[PDB]
Amino acid sequence: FEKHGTYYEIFVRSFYDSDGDGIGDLKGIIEKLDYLNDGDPETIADLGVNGIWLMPIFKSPSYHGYDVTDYYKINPDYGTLEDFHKLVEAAHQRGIKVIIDLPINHTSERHPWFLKASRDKNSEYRDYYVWAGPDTDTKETKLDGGRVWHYSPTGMYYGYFWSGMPDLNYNNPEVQEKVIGIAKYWLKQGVDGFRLDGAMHIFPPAQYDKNFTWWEKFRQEIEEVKPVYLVGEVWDISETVAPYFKYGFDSTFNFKLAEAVIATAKAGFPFGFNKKAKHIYGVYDREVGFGNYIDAPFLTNHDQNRILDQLGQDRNKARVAASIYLTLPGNPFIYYGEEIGMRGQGPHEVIREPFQWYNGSGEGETYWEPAMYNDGFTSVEQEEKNLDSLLNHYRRLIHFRNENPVFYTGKIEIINGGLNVVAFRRYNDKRDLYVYHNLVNRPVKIKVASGNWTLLFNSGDKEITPVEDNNKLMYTIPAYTTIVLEKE
Ligand SMILES: [Ca+2]
Ligand SMILES: [Ca+2]
């Protein structure tokens, strides 16, 4: 069970519509699988990703699905269980692992369990949720609203995010059993793992360690079915994220490093990235140990303003940002649309706009909401016209990564590549690669000690030939370009 690979995050509703109702669905993903990975490592006609993560696919009243009403039923909007099985089979045929979002931290207020527990204090499901006693304080800020305690005819219940999302009571052994059963069910349907929210607010501050006890039990029990891949979201500093690598998770999303990559690509100076990367990998190596964690680097996801927007809609800077994280250790995660330069900021609905397949309209393109910001802005059709497009840039980076696995499992050492360059070595006992990323709109020069060096990768379409003088090999890197050298 190979856990290393580049992942692609898909919002089913916005990917591909196979039956003409404007809503993206599972059969649609099947129809477009070759775009992600055609199963042939010899071609670069596909992105080359080896895993896909589907945002919530269970029954739910919302367009996003994070508030589940039935964990054993596929949202009709996305298709059927049969479609899901055909997708898992088609993906495996191509070497693509499939993981799905598992919203088990809370349920929808419309979930039967809650409806029953909320309409009878003596209900059999009463203890599936958390019911108040003292203080209905309410801590506030963030982006949503406020209050963690809410009214419900038979008492007030706990709901960290929103009254529509009551939190499940993990202090109840039955809740833990039920959720594990749900996970096992989907694994038996063919899934390879899950994407999970690691923070569980039902545990009072005094029971923080119960979080790790829970995830360890969860992983141990579900792997009784088969080996799995688990990636968790823990939106906090690296010191807080680190232990999760030890108690059940293979990977965790590197939010802090994402912020640094974005800031550095925007500014054109490597300081921020250099300092943050050294700190974070240092924390992970100290608390977990190199080789005992699979980081999940990324730029932006389904809850954040798209990378292009964060870079002032500068496609060149977005290109550099892509080269940087796609050459980092671990399993990189690509947010759908990122590879063709989609834009979107503000409302989560905008960030989750329909994926653009065509310049204009065409069969399969979703339209459940207006494509206000991307219609006519970018598309796969347009990106396919030139071998040096952003889409082809992503294809080249991912395939290069797959052809040189040291990028997944090797160590990393930040080095000084100059005032406007992010540089680092990716290495193991057999490969010693030097990676250089030009962050600005002008050529930059880098020098290495005279010796046996080989140019392995050039992200641009220009001829890059080094010159040797006074025992130093000098390379002039064109604007926003990345190169990889091998030292022997
Ligand atoms: Ca459809
Ligand atoms: Ca291929």
From TrEMBL:
Query: Would you kindly state one Gene Ontology biological process term found in this protein's UniProt entry?
Result: oligosaccharide catabolic process
Family per UniProt? Belongs to the glycosyl hydrolase 13 family.
GO molecular-function terms, A-Z: alpha-amylase activity; metal ion binding
Q: Report residues binding Ca(2+) 1.
A: D17, D19, D21, I23, D25
Glycosyl hydrolase family 13 catalytic domain sequence ranges = 9-401
Keyword Signal tagged: yes
Pfam families for the chain: Alpha-amylase
Q: What protein name does the entry list? A: Alpha-amylase A
Q: Where does Ca(2+) 2 bind?
A: D38, D40, T43, D46
- The domain of life is Bacteria
- Sorted alphabetically, which keywords does the UniProt record give? Calcium, Metal-binding, Signal
Stored InterPro entries:
GH, GH13_cat_dom, Glyco_hydro_b, O16G_dom_2
